[PDB]
Coordinates of C-alpha atoms and ligand atoms in Angstrom, one line a residue:
Chain H
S1 CA -0.1 0.1 0.0
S2 CA 3.0 2.5 1.3
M3 CA 5.2 3.7 -2.3
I4 CA 8.4 4.7 0.1
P5 CA 11.2 2.7 -1.2
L6 CA 12.8 0.2 1.1
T7 CA 16.6 1.2 1.9
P8 CA 19.1 1.1 4.6
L9 CA 18.6 4.9 5.7
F10 CA 14.6 4.3 5.6
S11 CA 15.0 1.2 7.9
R12 CA 17.1 3.3 10.5
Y13 CA 14.3 6.0 10.1
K14 CA 11.6 3.4 11.4
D15 CA 14.0 2.1 14.3
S16 CA 14.9 5.4 15.2
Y17 CA 10.9 6.6 15.1
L18 CA 10.1 3.6 17.0
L19 CA 12.6 4.2 19.5
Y20 CA 11.4 8.0 20.0
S21 CA 8.0 6.3 20.7
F22 CA 9.1 4.1 23.1
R23 CA 11.0 7.0 25.0
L24 CA 7.7 8.8 24.8
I25 CA 5.7 6.0 26.4
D26 CA 8.4 5.9 28.9
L27 CA 7.6 9.4 30.2
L28 CA 3.8 8.4 31.0
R29 CA 5.0 6.6 34.2
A30 CA 6.6 9.8 35.5
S31 CA 4.0 12.5 34.1
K32 CA 3.9 15.4 36.5
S33 CA 0.2 16.0 35.8
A34 CA -3.2 14.8 33.8
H35 CA -2.8 17.6 31.5
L36 CA 0.8 16.0 30.6
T37 CA -0.5 12.4 30.4
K38 CA -3.3 13.4 28.4
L39 CA -0.7 15.3 26.0
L40 CA 1.7 12.1 26.1
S41 CA -1.2 9.6 25.3
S42 CA -2.4 11.4 22.2
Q43 CA 1.4 11.7 20.6
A44 CA 1.9 8.4 21.5
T45 CA -1.4 7.6 20.1
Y46 CA -0.5 9.4 16.5
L47 CA 3.2 8.2 16.2
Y48 CA 1.9 4.2 16.3
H49 CA -1.0 5.3 14.1
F50 CA 1.7 6.5 11.4
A51 CA 4.2 3.7 12.1
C52 CA 2.7 0.4 12.7
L53 CA -1.1 0.8 12.7
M54 CA -2.3 3.1 9.3
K55 CA -1.2 -0.3 7.5
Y56 CA -3.8 -1.9 8.9
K57 CA -6.3 1.0 9.0
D58 CA -6.0 1.3 13.1
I59 CA -7.6 -2.1 13.5
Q60 CA -5.4 -2.4 16.4
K61 CA -6.1 1.0 17.8
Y62 CA -7.0 -0.6 20.9
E63 CA -4.1 -2.5 21.6
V64 CA -2.1 0.4 21.2
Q65 CA -4.4 2.2 24.0
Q66 CA -4.1 -0.9 26.4
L67 CA -0.4 -0.3 25.8
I68 CA -0.6 3.4 26.7
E69 CA -3.1 2.5 29.6
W70 CA 0.1 0.0 30.8
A71 CA 2.6 2.7 30.4
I72 CA 0.6 5.1 32.2
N73 CA 0.3 2.5 35.5
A74 CA 3.8 1.1 35.4
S75 CA 6.1 2.3 38.5
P76 CA 7.6 5.7 38.6
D77 CA 10.6 4.6 40.4
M78 CA 11.8 1.6 37.8
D79 CA 14.7 1.7 35.8
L80 CA 14.7 2.9 32.0
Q81 CA 15.8 -0.7 31.4
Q82 CA 13.3 -2.4 33.5
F83 CA 10.5 -0.4 31.6
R84 CA 12.1 -1.6 28.1
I85 CA 12.0 -5.2 29.6
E86 CA 8.2 -4.9 30.4
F87 CA 7.6 -3.0 27.5
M88 CA 8.9 -6.0 25.1
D89 CA 7.0 -8.3 27.0
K90 CA 3.9 -6.3 27.0
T91 CA 4.3 -5.0 23.1
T92 CA 4.6 -9.5 22.3
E93 CA 1.7 -9.9 24.6
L94 CA -0.4 -7.4 22.2
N95 CA 0.7 -8.5 18.9
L96 CA 2.7 -5.1 18.6
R97 CA 6.0 -6.7 17.5
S98 CA 5.8 -4.5 14.5
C99 CA 5.8 -1.4 16.7
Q100 CA 9.3 -2.5 18.9
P101 CA 12.6 -0.6 18.2
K102 CA 15.6 -2.7 17.5
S103 CA 18.4 -0.3 18.8
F104 CA 17.7 1.5 21.9
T105 CA 20.3 4.2 21.8
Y106 CA 18.7 7.9 21.8
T107 CA 20.7 10.6 20.3
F108 CA 19.4 14.1 18.4
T109 CA 20.1 11.6 15.8
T110 CA 17.0 9.4 16.7
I111 CA 14.5 12.5 16.6
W112 CA 15.9 13.8 13.2
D113 CA 15.3 10.2 12.0
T114 CA 11.9 10.3 13.4
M115 CA 11.1 14.0 11.6
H116 CA 12.5 12.3 8.2
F117 CA 10.4 9.1 8.8
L118 CA 7.1 11.5 8.9
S119 CA 8.0 13.8 6.2
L120 CA 8.4 10.5 3.8
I121 CA 4.8 9.4 5.4
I122 CA 3.4 12.7 4.3
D123 CA 4.7 12.4 0.7
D124 CA 3.4 9.0 0.2
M125 CA 0.0 9.6 1.8
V126 CA -0.2 12.6 -0.9
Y127 CA 1.4 10.6 -3.6
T128 CA -1.3 7.1 -3.5
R129 CA -4.2 9.7 -2.3
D130 CA -6.4 8.1 -5.4
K131 CA -5.7 5.1 -3.2
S132 CA -7.4 6.4 -0.3
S133 CA -9.3 9.9 -0.6
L134 CA -8.7 13.7 -0.5
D135 CA -10.7 13.6 3.0
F136 CA -8.3 10.9 4.5
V137 CA -5.2 12.7 3.5
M138 CA -6.5 16.2 4.7
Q139 CA -7.4 14.5 8.2
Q140 CA -4.0 12.8 8.3
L141 CA -2.4 16.5 7.7
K142 CA -4.2 18.1 11.0
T143 CA -2.8 15.2 13.1
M144 CA 0.8 15.7 11.5
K145 CA 0.6 19.4 12.4
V146 CA -0.2 18.3 15.8
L147 CA 2.6 16.0 15.8
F148 CA 5.0 18.5 14.9
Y149 CA 3.8 21.2 17.1
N150 CA 4.2 19.1 20.0
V151 CA 7.5 17.6 19.8
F152 CA 9.2 16.4 22.6
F153 CA 12.9 16.4 23.0
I154 CA 13.1 13.7 25.9
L155 CA 17.1 14.4 26.1
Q156 CA 17.8 17.8 27.6
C157 CA 18.4 21.0 25.6
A158 CA 16.8 24.2 26.6
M159 CA 18.5 25.8 23.6
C160 CA 16.8 23.3 21.3
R161 CA 13.5 23.7 22.6
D162 CA 13.1 27.5 22.6
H163 CA 14.4 27.5 19.0
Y164 CA 12.0 25.0 17.8
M165 CA 9.4 26.9 19.3
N166 CA 10.9 29.9 17.0
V167 CA 11.1 28.0 13.5
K168 CA 8.8 25.2 14.0
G169 CA 6.5 26.9 11.8
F170 CA 8.3 26.7 9.0
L171 CA 7.3 22.8 9.0
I172 CA 3.7 23.5 9.8
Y173 CA 3.6 25.9 6.9
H174 CA 4.6 23.2 4.4
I175 CA 1.7 21.0 5.8
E176 CA -0.8 23.8 5.0
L177 CA 0.7 23.9 1.8
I178 CA 0.0 20.6 0.9
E179 CA -3.2 21.0 2.3
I180 CA -3.6 23.9 -0.5
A181 CA -2.8 21.8 -3.0
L182 CA -5.1 19.0 -1.9
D183 CA -8.3 21.5 -1.6
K184 CA -7.4 23.2 -5.2
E185 CA -7.6 19.5 -6.5
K186 CA -11.2 19.3 -4.3
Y187 CA -12.2 22.1 -6.6
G188 CA -11.2 20.9 -9.6
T189 CA -7.6 21.4 -10.7
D190 CA -5.6 18.5 -10.5
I191 CA -2.0 18.7 -8.7
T192 CA 0.7 18.7 -11.3
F193 CA 4.0 17.4 -9.7
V194 CA 7.1 19.5 -10.5
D195 CA 10.8 19.1 -9.6
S196 CA 11.6 22.6 -8.2
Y197 CA 10.7 24.0 -4.7
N211 CA -2.0 26.6 -11.2
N212 CA -1.8 23.6 -8.9
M213 CA 2.1 22.8 -9.0
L214 CA 3.9 20.6 -5.8
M215 CA 7.3 19.7 -5.8
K216 CA 7.8 15.8 -6.0
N217 CA 8.8 14.9 -2.4
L218 CA 8.1 17.9 -0.9
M219 CA 8.5 17.3 2.5
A220 CA 11.5 15.2 2.6
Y221 CA 13.3 18.3 0.9
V222 CA 11.5 20.4 3.1
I223 CA 12.7 18.4 6.5
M224 CA 15.9 17.9 5.0
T225 CA 16.2 21.8 4.4
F226 CA 15.3 22.4 8.2
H227 CA 17.5 20.1 9.1
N228 CA 20.5 21.8 7.5
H229 CA 19.0 25.4 8.8
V230 CA 19.0 24.1 12.3
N231 CA 23.0 22.6 12.1
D232 CA 24.3 26.1 10.4
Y233 CA 22.2 28.0 13.3
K234 CA 23.5 26.2 15.9
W235 CA 27.2 27.7 15.0
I236 CA 25.7 31.3 15.3
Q237 CA 23.9 30.4 18.7
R238 CA 27.3 29.1 19.7
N239 CA 29.1 32.1 18.5
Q240 CA 31.4 30.0 16.4
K241 CA 32.9 29.4 12.8
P242 CA 31.3 26.2 11.9
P243 CA 34.4 23.2 12.2
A244 CA 36.1 22.5 9.5
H245 CA 34.6 19.6 8.8
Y246 CA 30.9 20.3 8.9
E247 CA 29.0 19.6 5.8
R248 CA 25.0 20.0 4.8
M249 CA 23.1 17.4 3.3
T250 CA 22.6 17.8 -0.5
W251 CA 19.4 17.2 -2.0
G252 CA 20.9 15.3 -4.9
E253 CA 22.8 13.0 -2.4
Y254 CA 19.4 12.6 -0.5
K255 CA 17.5 11.6 -3.0
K256 CA 19.8 9.0 -3.9
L257 CA 20.1 7.8 -0.2
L258 CA 16.6 6.9 -0.1
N259 CA 15.7 6.4 -3.6
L260 CA 13.2 9.2 -4.2
Chain O
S1 CA 21.0 56.6 4.6
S2 CA 18.0 54.0 3.8
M3 CA 17.8 53.0 0.1
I4 CA 14.2 51.8 0.1
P5 CA 12.5 53.3 -3.0
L6 CA 9.6 55.7 -2.5
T7 CA 6.6 54.7 -4.1
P8 CA 2.9 55.2 -3.3
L9 CA 2.9 51.8 -1.7
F10 CA 5.4 52.3 0.4
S11 CA 4.0 55.4 1.3
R12 CA 1.1 53.7 2.5
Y13 CA 2.8 50.6 4.3
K14 CA 4.7 53.4 6.2
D15 CA 1.3 55.2 7.2
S16 CA -0.5 51.8 8.2
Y17 CA 2.7 51.1 10.4
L18 CA 2.4 54.1 12.6
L19 CA -1.6 53.5 12.8
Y20 CA -0.5 50.0 14.0
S21 CA 2.1 51.5 16.3
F22 CA -0.7 54.0 17.3
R23 CA -3.2 51.3 18.0
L24 CA -0.4 49.2 20.2
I25 CA 0.2 51.9 22.7
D26 CA -3.5 53.3 22.8
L27 CA -3.5 49.5 24.8
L28 CA -1.1 50.4 27.2
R29 CA -4.0 52.6 29.3
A30 CA -6.1 49.2 29.4
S31 CA -3.2 46.8 30.1
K32 CA -4.5 44.0 32.5
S33 CA -1.2 43.3 33.7
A34 CA 2.4 45.0 34.6
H35 CA 3.6 41.5 32.2
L36 CA 1.4 42.8 29.5
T37 CA 2.5 46.4 29.6
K38 CA 6.4 45.1 29.9
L39 CA 5.5 43.1 26.5
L40 CA 3.6 46.1 25.0
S41 CA 6.2 48.8 25.7
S42 CA 9.0 46.7 24.4
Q43 CA 6.9 46.1 21.0
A44 CA 6.3 49.7 21.0
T45 CA 10.0 50.5 21.7
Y46 CA 10.9 48.5 18.9
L47 CA 8.4 49.6 16.2
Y48 CA 8.9 53.2 17.1
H49 CA 12.5 52.3 16.5
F50 CA 12.2 50.9 13.1
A51 CA 10.0 53.4 11.7
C52 CA 11.2 57.1 12.8
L53 CA 14.1 56.6 15.2
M54 CA 16.9 54.5 13.6
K55 CA 17.4 57.0 10.8
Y56 CA 19.1 59.5 13.6
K57 CA 20.4 56.5 15.4
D58 CA 17.7 56.5 18.2
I59 CA 19.0 60.0 19.2
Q60 CA 14.9 60.5 20.5
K61 CA 14.9 57.4 22.1
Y62 CA 14.2 58.9 25.5
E63 CA 11.2 61.0 23.6
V64 CA 9.7 57.5 22.5
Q65 CA 10.2 56.6 26.4
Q66 CA 8.4 59.2 27.4
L67 CA 5.5 58.8 24.8
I68 CA 5.1 55.3 26.2
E69 CA 5.2 56.5 29.7
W70 CA 2.4 59.1 29.1
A71 CA 0.5 56.3 27.3
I72 CA 0.8 54.0 30.2
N73 CA -0.5 56.7 32.5
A74 CA -3.6 58.2 30.3
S75 CA -6.9 57.1 31.5
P76 CA -8.4 53.9 30.6
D77 CA -11.8 55.1 30.5
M78 CA -11.5 57.6 27.7
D79 CA -12.2 56.8 24.2
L80 CA -10.2 56.0 21.5
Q81 CA -10.8 59.1 19.6
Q82 CA -9.8 61.2 22.6
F83 CA -6.7 59.1 22.9
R84 CA -6.2 60.3 19.5
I85 CA -6.4 63.9 20.0
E86 CA -3.8 63.6 23.1
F87 CA -1.5 61.1 21.4
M88 CA -1.4 63.7 18.5
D89 CA -0.7 66.8 21.0
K90 CA 1.9 64.7 22.8
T91 CA 4.2 63.6 19.9
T92 CA 4.0 67.1 18.4
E93 CA 5.1 68.4 21.7
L94 CA 8.0 65.7 21.8
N95 CA 9.2 66.5 18.3
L96 CA 7.9 63.1 17.1
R97 CA 5.5 64.2 14.0
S98 CA 7.7 61.8 12.1
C99 CA 5.8 59.0 14.2
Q100 CA 2.3 60.1 13.5
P101 CA -0.1 58.2 11.4
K102 CA -2.5 60.3 8.9
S103 CA -4.9 57.5 8.3
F104 CA -6.7 56.0 11.5
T105 CA -8.7 53.5 9.9
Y106 CA -7.5 50.0 10.8
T107 CA -8.1 46.6 9.1
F108 CA -6.5 43.6 8.4
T109 CA -4.8 45.7 5.9
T110 CA -3.2 47.8 8.2
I111 CA -1.3 44.6 10.2
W112 CA -0.2 42.9 6.6
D113 CA 1.3 46.8 5.5
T114 CA 3.1 46.9 8.9
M115 CA 4.6 43.3 8.3
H116 CA 5.5 44.3 4.7
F117 CA 6.9 47.8 5.8
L118 CA 9.7 45.6 8.1
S119 CA 10.2 43.2 5.5
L120 CA 11.5 45.9 3.5
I121 CA 13.5 47.4 6.4
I122 CA 15.3 44.0 6.8
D123 CA 16.3 44.0 3.2
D124 CA 17.7 47.3 3.1
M125 CA 19.4 46.9 6.4
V126 CA 21.1 43.8 4.9
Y127 CA 22.1 45.4 1.7
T128 CA 23.5 48.6 3.1
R129 CA 25.3 46.6 5.8
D130 CA 28.6 48.0 4.4
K131 CA 27.3 51.4 5.8
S132 CA 26.8 50.1 9.4
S133 CA 28.2 46.9 10.7
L134 CA 27.8 43.2 10.5
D135 CA 26.9 43.0 14.4
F136 CA 24.7 46.0 13.9
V137 CA 22.6 44.3 11.5
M138 CA 22.6 40.9 13.5
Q139 CA 21.5 42.9 16.6
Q140 CA 18.4 44.6 14.4
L141 CA 17.7 41.3 13.2
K142 CA 17.1 39.5 17.0
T143 CA 15.0 42.6 17.6
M144 CA 12.8 41.7 14.2
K145 CA 12.5 38.3 15.4
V146 CA 10.9 39.3 18.7
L147 CA 8.7 41.6 17.0
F148 CA 7.2 39.0 14.5
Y149 CA 7.1 36.4 17.7
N150 CA 4.7 38.9 19.2
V151 CA 2.1 40.2 16.8
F152 CA -0.8 41.8 18.6
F153 CA -3.4 41.7 16.2
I154 CA -5.7 44.1 17.9
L155 CA -8.9 43.6 15.9
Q156 CA -10.6 40.3 17.1
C157 CA -9.9 37.2 15.4
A158 CA -9.1 34.1 17.5
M159 CA -8.5 32.2 14.2
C160 CA -6.1 34.4 12.8
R161 CA -4.1 34.6 16.5
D162 CA -4.0 30.2 16.5
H163 CA -2.9 30.1 12.8
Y164 CA -0.1 33.0 13.3
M165 CA 1.0 30.7 16.6
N166 CA 1.2 27.9 14.1
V167 CA 3.1 29.2 10.8
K168 CA 4.6 32.5 12.5
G169 CA 8.0 30.3 12.6
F170 CA 7.9 30.4 8.4
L171 CA 8.9 34.2 8.7
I172 CA 11.2 33.8 11.7
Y173 CA 13.1 31.2 10.0
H174 CA 13.9 33.1 7.1
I175 CA 15.3 35.9 9.5
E176 CA 17.7 33.2 10.8
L177 CA 18.6 32.3 7.4
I178 CA 20.0 35.9 6.8
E179 CA 21.5 35.5 9.9
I180 CA 23.5 32.6 8.5
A181 CA 24.5 34.7 5.4
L182 CA 25.8 37.3 7.4
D183 CA 27.5 35.1 9.7
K184 CA 29.4 33.1 6.8
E185 CA 30.5 36.8 5.4
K186 CA 32.1 37.2 9.0
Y187 CA 33.9 34.0 8.5
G188 CA 35.0 35.4 5.2
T189 CA 33.1 34.5 2.3
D190 CA 30.9 37.5 1.1
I191 CA 27.1 37.7 0.0
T192 CA 26.3 36.8 -3.6
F193 CA 23.0 37.9 -4.1
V194 CA 20.7 36.0 -6.5
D195 CA 17.3 36.7 -8.3
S196 CA 15.8 33.4 -7.2
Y197 CA 14.7 31.9 -4.2
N211 CA 28.6 28.7 -1.1
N212 CA 27.0 32.2 0.4
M213 CA 24.1 33.2 -1.7
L214 CA 21.0 35.4 -0.7
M215 CA 18.0 36.3 -2.7
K216 CA 17.6 39.9 -3.3
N217 CA 15.2 41.5 -1.7
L218 CA 14.4 37.8 0.0
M219 CA 12.5 39.2 2.7
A220 CA 10.2 41.1 0.7
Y221 CA 9.6 37.9 -1.3
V222 CA 9.0 35.9 2.0
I223 CA 6.2 38.1 3.6
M224 CA 4.6 38.8 0.2
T225 CA 4.4 34.6 -0.1
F226 CA 3.4 34.2 3.6
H227 CA 0.5 36.7 2.6
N228 CA -0.6 34.5 -0.1
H229 CA -0.1 31.5 1.8
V230 CA -2.8 33.0 4.6
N231 CA -5.1 34.1 2.1
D232 CA -5.2 30.6 0.3
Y233 CA -5.7 29.2 3.5
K234 CA -8.3 31.0 4.9
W235 CA -10.9 29.2 2.3
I236 CA -9.5 25.8 3.5
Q237 CA -10.9 27.3 7.1
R238 CA -14.0 28.3 5.9
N239 CA -13.9 25.0 3.8
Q240 CA -14.9 26.8 0.9
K241 CA -14.1 27.2 -2.7
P242 CA -12.0 30.4 -3.1
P243 CA -13.9 33.7 -4.3
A244 CA -14.2 33.5 -8.1
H245 CA -12.7 37.1 -8.3
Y246 CA -9.9 35.8 -5.5
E247 CA -6.1 36.2 -6.7
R248 CA -2.5 36.0 -5.5
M249 CA -0.2 38.7 -5.7
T250 CA 2.7 38.2 -8.3
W251 CA 6.5 38.9 -7.4
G252 CA 6.6 40.4 -11.0
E253 CA 4.0 43.0 -10.2
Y254 CA 4.9 43.1 -6.5
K255 CA 8.5 44.4 -7.1
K256 CA 7.3 47.0 -9.7
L257 CA 4.5 48.4 -7.4
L258 CA 7.5 49.1 -5.0
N259 CA 10.2 49.3 -7.4
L260 CA 12.4 46.8 -6.3
Ligands
LIG301 C1 13.9 19.4 16.3 C2 15.3 19.8 16.5 C3 16.1 21.3 17.2 C4 17.0 21.3 17.5 N1 17.9 22.7 17.7 C5 19.1 23.0 17.8 C6 19.4 24.0 18.1 O1 18.9 25.4 18.7 N2 20.7 24.3 18.8 C7 21.5 23.1 18.4 O2 22.8 23.5 19.3 N3 21.3 21.7 18.5 C8 19.6 21.6 18.2 N4 19.8 20.7 17.6 C9 20.5 19.6 17.7 C10 21.2 19.5 16.2 O3 20.3 19.5 14.9 C11 22.2 18.0 16.1 O4 21.2 17.0 15.9 C12 23.0 18.0 17.2 O5 24.1 19.1 17.5 C13 24.1 16.9 16.9 O6 24.9 17.4 15.8 P1 25.5 16.1 14.7 O7 27.1 16.7 14.4 O8 25.5 14.7 15.6 O9 24.4 16.2 13.5 P2 22.9 15.5 13.2 O10 22.5 16.6 12.4 O11 22.3 15.2 14.2 O12 23.5 14.2 12.2 C14 22.6 13.1 12.4 C15 22.6 12.3 11.2 O13 21.7 12.9 9.9 C16 22.1 13.0 8.7 N5 22.1 14.6 8.2 C17 23.0 15.6 8.5 N6 22.2 16.4 7.9 C18 20.9 16.4 7.1 C19 19.8 16.8 6.5 N7 20.0 18.0 6.5 N8 18.7 16.1 6.2 C20 18.7 14.8 6.5 N9 20.1 13.9 7.2 C21 20.9 14.8 7.6 C22 23.9 13.0 8.9 O14 24.1 12.4 7.8 C23 23.8 11.8 10.3 O15 23.5 10.6 9.7 C24 18.1 20.5 17.4 C25 17.7 19.0 17.3 C26 16.6 18.8 16.8 C27 15.9 17.5 16.3
LIG302 C1 -0.4 37.7 10.8 C2 -2.1 37.6 10.0 C3 -2.4 36.5 9.7 C4 -3.9 36.0 9.6 N1 -4.6 35.1 9.6 C5 -5.7 34.1 9.0 C6 -6.1 33.1 9.6 O1 -6.2 32.7 9.9 N2 -7.5 33.0 8.6 C7 -8.3 34.6 8.3 O2 -9.5 34.0 7.8 N3 -7.8 35.8 8.0 C8 -6.6 35.8 8.5 N4 -5.6 36.8 8.2 C9 -6.7 37.9 7.3 C10 -6.5 37.9 6.1 O3 -5.0 37.6 5.5 C11 -7.5 39.0 5.2 O4 -6.1 39.9 5.5 C12 -8.5 39.4 5.6 O5 -9.4 38.1 5.3 C13 -9.0 40.3 4.9 O6 -8.7 39.9 3.4 P1 -9.2 41.3 2.0 O7 -9.9 40.7 1.1 O8 -9.6 42.4 2.6 O9 -7.4 41.0 1.4 P2 -6.0 41.4 2.0 O10 -4.9 40.5 2.0 O11 -5.9 41.9 3.5 O12 -5.6 42.8 1.1 C14 -5.0 44.0 1.7 C15 -4.0 44.4 0.7 O13 -2.8 43.6 0.3 C16 -2.7 43.4 -1.0 N5 -2.0 42.0 -1.1 C17 -2.7 40.8 -1.3 N6 -1.8 39.8 -1.5 C18 -0.8 40.5 -1.0 C19 0.2 39.8 -0.9 N7 0.5 38.4 -0.7 N8 1.3 40.6 -0.7 C20 1.4 41.8 -0.5 N9 0.2 42.4 -0.7 C21 -1.0 41.9 -0.9 C22 -4.1 43.8 -2.1 O14 -3.6 44.3 -3.0 C23 -4.7 45.0 -0.9 O15 -4.1 45.9 -1.4 C24 -4.6 37.3 9.0 C25 -4.3 38.3 8.7 C26 -3.1 38.5 9.3 C27 -2.3 40.3 9.0

């Protein structure tokens, strides 16, 4: 059903994304408030939706609700390593092996990979909209905006949080931009897909967008630090990026 | 000192911007809190800075501090029309006729014109940086980001506020992008100015950016309303926009 090519990089993205979703539900047992439990639970709901449930039209939505319910009720005092044990036990129990990470080392790269994963899901949903509907895609895009608006870092970086709070709109803007092309199709002018950035839409737009945003954040971090970029620092190019993902 | 061409449209922008700054200080007498008075006072400080003070290197900064102080102390019960009288009296008193609006009819267009004004100031500061310094421009850009982060609508539109909260980062992103080109110049690679959107920067980038953002918000409003765009609705094109402003 999904047309995303299988590549070593997409495999890494998917695994990082599952790790991210795991570190997120891990936060549930330690939630300081009902309001945060509600926010965390809806984020994990959407995350698992996009990675392991949507393939089967969310038929397993209740099993995820149960995984979330279990996570909220787990002990706040147990170690991340104990939670890992029980999490793996519970996901197997619930027939959600597909939602389990294989690698558990969490870095900034995990969070970036997670964002790049979503960008690919977004482009793929748009590409294959004729197999779902315009309405279904519009509804998934609303959820995507909520997801990007509410990114939890998990690791500690107050500078990262403030900065993302300031520029996350660049990402949401491009989701609205897709919604505009879909609505123009709804009203009678099919999307024409183009190579470059009355109804035109760049092919693989969202993959390009987040690649671009990822370079921008890394260029900006040298200004934050008030330093010349390291001698070996280099941006990802769109030519290489498309080849790595076979776009 | 400023290289922005004089055109009827730029005149309208400047007047709208002064009206906006006036409607902002009008809010001071009615402020519900110290925290809001502080936020409102810093916004008006920056606004007048960019429109009527920076030409003379903020030599009149204290007169504006006095205008703000007066506005905070004015009666909360007097009518906008009374405040207009006294405001005009006080600005004349303080030799700030240059900061007075001529037209007082406040619309969404006033707010857009205000944003377009700032975009032109941003491009102009970058263009003429050799006459100030890289540091001075970097410092003005920080202030620009604060200004755009904290836009008050003044008129009532809860939909507008939520939406701008979600996508304002598109604008701030482009301010950081300018900061990246300036820092790359600092470290030894002059900016090359280009026509289209190792150190390249689009000429009139920020004018293009906010023009683009203004079209996006107007396209998006039909999706919010769940309607086909009106038969006579049309986007501004960059070709016409540059001619209107003689860019
Ligand atoms: C949302 C977010 C906001 C952040 N904000 C800040 C901040 O304000 N200040 C700060 O100092 N740090 C911030 N960070 C972290 C920063 O972006 C780096 O990830 C971190 O400094 C580690 O750098 P790294 O050298 O390990 O490179 P990373 O960028 O983390 O590299 C990880 C992997 O990504 C690949 N890669 C590099 N560029 C791209 C690209 N453009 N597209 C796709 N893949 C790419 C690399 O090949 C490598 O495989 C933020 C991170 C995120 C996720
Ligand atoms: C920051 C902000 C956020 C907003 N968010 C929303 C929202 O979420 N939902 C909503 O319904 N409304 C929103 N609005 C208002 C909306 O953008 C319109 O301004 C409003 O609906 C009135 O439309 P209008 O027909 O009078 O056109 P306006 O766009 O307000 O037109 C005013 C003038 O701008 C010119 N113009 C048109 N397009 C451009 C362009 N791209 N660049 C430069 N000039 C242009 C026109 O020629 C005209 O002279 C927002 C406004 C602002 C300032």
